[PDB]
Amino acid sequence: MVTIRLARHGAKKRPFYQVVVADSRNARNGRFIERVGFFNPIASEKEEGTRLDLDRIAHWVGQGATISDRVAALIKEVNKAA
């Protein structure tokens, strides 16, 4: 299927996960149809740590794209922060 998932682009001891609407059978860092948002785990205070375009995400979930565990928890976190 096409999933919305997280690719870990960063350095040692300090990751940074960008969400991607990608195929299942590709690599983690591999190709993706569309890039939506990001989630910085060690994002500090007074700033923005997570950013997801829920328009495109709900558009793909209508289009049949499933979800991931971590990005499911993150989408719940964004709609709770609402």
Q: Does 52 engage in binding with RNA (CB under 7 A)?
A: no
Binding mask 4-43 for RNA (x = CB under 7 A): -xxxxxxxxxxxxxx----xxxxxxxxx-x-x--x--xx-
- Name 5's bridge partners: 20
Q: Does 58 bind RNA (CB under 7 A)?
A: no
- Binding residues for RNA, total number by CB under 7 A: 48
Beta strands of 1-82 (E only): which ranges? 2-8, 17-23, 34-39, 50-51
Closest CA to 80 of 52, 61, 56: 52
- Give the residue, chosen from 2, 54, 56, 59, that forms a contact with RNA under the rule CB under 7 A: 2
